[PDB]
């Protein structure tokens, strides 16, 4: 388990971290942590590492490409003082493209967006003991399907940050690509985006894996 | 024009014929059509046939299949004694095997599909001037795409019955189709089957074209 | 189609134009477009224009005169940089006149009117690519009701306003007058101002036809 | 003063009298009588007559014609053993020939309106002590208007049924029309139906002035 | 009657004047007016003076003493420019001296009062046509009744400022006196103090009798 | 403490004794038993007799009449099984006397009130350990204020038939009569029947009086 | 994994279970199912085992004891068809004893406990493929409260009839004892019941490790 | 009793005293007190002391710790310029080392509690009349449940500070505990700290014994 006793770790994001979480403060009361991955999280965190003492605080904020996590950066991450930091963003900024492709304003193209992530990486990384980049997804088994397409682009920059600059690495679209051998996206969520519980187990489970959570303890 | 004066037009289906329409009646006003297509293209042929003097009822429920349909049939169609009456069923038929792929009683295969709507149009037929046959859509241009190929199938069968009953025949996958070659699904519906105000247009459009609707009457 | 591709089409007006649409912004999700013959314009160019790649603002706002609209002209027409402004004004500055006679501060007089619109486009022209008038409309036929003479005056300087400023011109009056033709103006709008979907498709047509659409493109 | 003491004065009609009065029972309270004339009236005598002890009951239904009394009459009407019943019907009777043209079966023509009203005018008469016959009315000065034409038509026959079953008579579309003189019919109701507080004020005028209400007590 | 065409007539006072009215205007719509006395003499001057075009205002706050109307006398009488105000108060400056007989700063007593409304009626006299002062009321027959016996005074106050000052006058406590030799209180108020319609009848016929309504005009 | 261990205690009445107790069965929680008097007594007993086990059921019902009583009384009491049946009631029979004095059928008079809770009584007696008779009251100083006399009279009634079966009794009336000497009505309630948490306590310690509570347990 | 593919697993319960299930159905969705530890266990096995096709029902209840499971078996157990059932009752049959020790017809005690839900599994057994029985549990450390030393005698009750009826067993008490080594209960649930997003990990873990699930598949 | 008339006795704590008050003013209208302890000591005061005169004010705040009250203890205590304080708190301060024991900032502890609370009552003390001193309390048998036993020690550092200090002293933890020799404590608050009106009446009775209410004056 990376994550150390007393330690804080902060999650940021788009929907998918959000989930209803409690604006500002995003702690504690999982109510407060939403309903989703990060409270499912928490809560293995919490059935098997009771006495770990985490404090695990959720900044996901619907609707947030990159260049609105840099916007709120300073307020919702730096000021926090986190030790770790897990960040999963890109569908919005991918999306955008696909559902206003007229909107351009809203939409974050590649370039734009690696530079961006670099850059919250570079900022935050003589601040934190550690970082978490999750890739964002498309629930979508195709390949060649434009957005698909587009997502794994995206994800592959979201790999090569977290090589060059030694964070922690999750990748999202991997973790459905298994599950989409079987089910068809609808399953799993019927706008490609936001999925069910089952979604959120994937994410949760890929998160926990990749910070070295067991199961059952060998320890 | 295919509807004449005095004639009374009833549209079934599912929720992209419902929009909201008032239940039990799905007539009476403003607001009784629904949201959607239904009430686009009642508008529509008042504002260009207003001497027409149809009746139009809204009989769509929201989640129907055509097993759903088959129960409702006698007190929704045939006791209203329409003149026309306009069918567009098979998404859930359909849907159902890719979003709740264990839950077998809720899909409607396709044996069981042809054979009642086949066997409702034949019941339908002699007791009415007219019947409209519009096919399911699923706003996809991958033709490979396993739902879209499922429902192109279905689609077929509702063609082939039109053209073996003689009915009015609408192809709506066809209209979906050529704005697909522009426009990526997620801009007109993200889950691919409830669209916006444009999607609710091409289906009006495409019944208005079918049905002799001319947009500045020639005469 | 007088509208180019990439083009900004922003619309304003009262509630006939609002029609519950988001505010401030009015744009894009059609939710944000409102329910009304703005939201249907914007479907049909989808629908039939897709590749256009128009954008669309809806910057209506219930209980307006002209001259609310000269108070927020800056923030909500010019800030937004359109390529193309249409403007359907009038409708409550000559209601208050009948609705609420001695209220006067609520009333604008036909020469404040004329002058004042005169004004808007005056303002607007040398920015634009072009603009569109809309006649302000009464559902009304018969021509000496009080409130019906009166607006017609009102349509009429309208009218001499876009042959003077060589804007488009669209003649709402004309439009609602053929279809009561034959309809009782209940049959449209029980207070013979906000219509049914009926009557926010004749003025989407109406609209329509003055930009140059084709129902069925030969292009 | 017509009604005397102890008597239970029953109102019957359609929203006019309903104004969101109680349901089923419409009697009982600060409130159950609703907003309109029929609270104006029982406000009235009680603030002018106190004495009397009147029971006053409003059966007013909004939607309905005298179609729907005659379904509701027994129930209503001959269960409440009221001695006085007031009937304000005629204004749905007409306004659905108007408003809803081609739905043939809401509306009520002169030939079931005639017959329906006189039948339960003559079957009430003989057990009760008394009937107020009130015209329906539109809030429409022009006499050549079809609504307005149509409905003076209907108020002949109240007029002329009350004349030959010796009851009491409102004529409240004379009562508006002397209003109408000065104000168009927007300043009292938008539909021309539902009246302002001034509109049920007028009402409540002509029915007291009918059974011999004085403002001023002149013993 | 004493207000003339083109007039501003302004109420003034505590919940039995403001009756849920539009805050803050007060004006115009009835809506605007509330559901009491102010709406229904509004109602009845519309009803039988429609040409007199009068613009009635409504600034009762509920819970207000005399203190409170000092306190906003400025804003809500003064800039509005009357030509006639009305003045309701004193219910609560006794209210409160029985119901919350030990929060003492809540009282207003009677030489505060009867200063306080005197300043009110001469700061307002030169700049309006016209003032009429009602009295509070006690919906309570006993005159021993402590409460009734302390409103008297009050009343006794009012009718005195109304002769010094030559204003209009309404002995609202006299018009309930004579209902109540018939209605024991409750039958009007169980509060003895907010009453149903026939209350506000009674208020609104005792103001309209001062300002020479007549009921059927001979002019 | 008349009330012994493992007894189940039924509280019967009009809104005083209901407080919004949860329907249909008054008993089982942190707030069946409603928010006044039942709840009072019910709190304290446990706060200083934990040790007695006592079941208390709510089956007070706003509005109520003995006359409503006698309706339910079968399913109400009697099916509860109760040990101890404590009823208040008198306050609506008399009340709408009062407040709807020409709704003659809604009156419970002095014999119609005698004969049915006499009954009541008597038949409930052998089959229960206990019954307490609590007055009706009106919270009014003055004897001879009209209502305050009647309810007197049926409090009279009510102890009569306490004596007469030998059941205990709670007078109501003077306990509120006591606080009177120092307060004025509206003080404990506006409308002289549904009083503050003081009334409640005021009916709850009369109460437990005549069960022989003792505040500290001598013991 | 012990349950197979195209198997229907079937869990049945109080409040724990239900967690805001779908009623009647508890089946068909993106949240049918709940928010507890019955929508974790189902999003885990889709993670991790996509492949099983199972179909999974909730038919938990709030408040239920096992006399409450066994009136609704027939129609919510045994008509689902299930292959799998999966029960967690006693939770109530318990803590009414002991927040209600007064209400004894409210109390399940271990005789009715042993009798009813022995009963249920001996009837339900032939008629599936297997049953898996989850113990109840109270969140508290100390095996001497109480409540807690009650709810572990219920829980050998359970152990000893799936011991003997070879039904699997999942040991919930064990499963919150090992956290509670370190968590006071307040820390997972205020009432020592109804836990957080961790209680309910806590449970889908337990339920499971007896199935078989693995967290990252061997093969 | 030590509480005379005229004087204000003001009320402050977390959320046992705050109860639902009315915020900020918290005074008089019961409903402004809440629906707790507070409120029923007034009612219980007014009840039998009507003529004393007592204004009392809540101040509760749900949630607060001591940290909190000295925080707000200028505007919410001082500037009330109270005659009477009433301080209960260390709930939430002990709490929360239990419920949310990684969020270390939200903790209390006993040397900072103690300093705390001292310096409220030395700031206080030269400025009131008097000060009532009411330990916290948790509803838990088990003097060694951890948390019960912290509470203990709260609750004696309480004690100290009110004999030090020569103020009034309520052991609101001794109160409970005698019940809690019978009930277990569910049975008055499953959260062990949120209790039913009986736990409300065990404030409140502990209160007035120890301001020298008589239940029964003898005076
Ligand atoms: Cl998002
Ligand atoms: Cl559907
Ligand atoms: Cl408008
Ligand atoms: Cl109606
Ligand atoms: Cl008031
Ligand atoms: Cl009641
Ligand atoms: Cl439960
Ligand atoms: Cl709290």
């Known amino acids: 388990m990376k994550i150390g006793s007393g330690e804080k770790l902060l ?3 788009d929907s998918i971290t959000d989930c ?10 999982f109510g407060a942590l939403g309903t989703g991955y990060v409270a499912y999280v928490v ?38 003082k986190p030790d770790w930091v ?4 890109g569908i919005n900024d991918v999306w955008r493209q696909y559902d206003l492709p007229f909107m351009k304003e809203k939409h ?14 570079l900022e935050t990384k003589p601040l ?16 060649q399907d434009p957005m698909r397409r587009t997502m794994d682009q995206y994800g592959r920059v979201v790999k090569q940050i977290a090589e060059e600059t030694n964070s922690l690495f999750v990748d999202t679209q991997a973790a459905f ?10 399953a799993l969520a019927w706008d490609r985006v936001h999925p069910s519980v ?21 320890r």
Do not use: C
């Open 20 to 29: 209803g979480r409690a604006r500002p403060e995003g702690e504690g009361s």
């Open 86 to 89: 897990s960040i999963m963003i």
């Open 177 to 186: 690509n298994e599950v989409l051998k079987t089910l068809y996206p609808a």
């Open 43 to 80: 809560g293995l965190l919490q059935a098997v590492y009771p006495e770990l003492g985490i404090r695990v605080v959720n900044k996901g904020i619907s609707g947030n490409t990159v260049r609105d996590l840099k916007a709120r950066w300073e307020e919702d991450v730096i000021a926090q």
């Open 108 to 121: 974050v193209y590649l370039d734009e967006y690696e530079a961006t992530l670099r850059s919250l990486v």
């Open 11 to 13: 999650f940021i994001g």
């Open 128 to 143: 934190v003991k550690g970082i978490i980049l999750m890739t964002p997804f498309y629930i979508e088994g195709n390949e």
């Open 198 to 218: 089952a979604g959120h187990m994937i994410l949760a489970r890929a998160f926990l894996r990749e910070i070295g959570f067991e199961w059952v303890r060998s």
